[PDB]
Amino acid sequence: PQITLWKRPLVTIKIGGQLKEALLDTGADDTVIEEMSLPGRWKPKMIGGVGGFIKVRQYDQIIIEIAGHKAIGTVLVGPTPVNIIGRNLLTQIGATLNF
């Protein structure tokens, strides 16, 4: 689809058996989701943006369905105010910015 930017570009995602809303975020290197359980091993990470850094758990090789399109990649889990789909997964669903 073509998504305009008059409002936040929020989509439904499926991750870990759960439906969530997330922001399609070209300004994010990483995909960061609010607290949830994910299977497998993880490692701690610090990620930053405006306002500084938060501590997250890094899970690798996680499958997500983003607006109907499946992708696999690293997912970070922690106290983000909004769930964000960053470039590591946007690339996999073929997302581009066009103007």
Add this chain to the structure above:
Amino acid sequence: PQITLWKRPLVTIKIGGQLKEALLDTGADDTVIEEMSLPGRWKPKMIGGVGGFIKVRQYDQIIIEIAGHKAIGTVLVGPTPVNIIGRNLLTQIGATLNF
């Protein structure tokens, strides 16, 4: 252009006669730039990022060129780690996200 997301979507902007690098960010509601001087009066705003809130100066009706496309709109100035072009100006240059 069509901008893919394998790398950060960094473009050149021109503001106050100066060239700067900035991130085209569909996840950002607002445009925020690192400290610089802009003309006129400003108003206060607090904006929230992944790591918390920062105080910024809001300048309205600022002339800015984004990857060659002219816009005139609101620019926030403050302690952002990266210059960010948000949806308020992405919509003026006709940007969409497509997949």
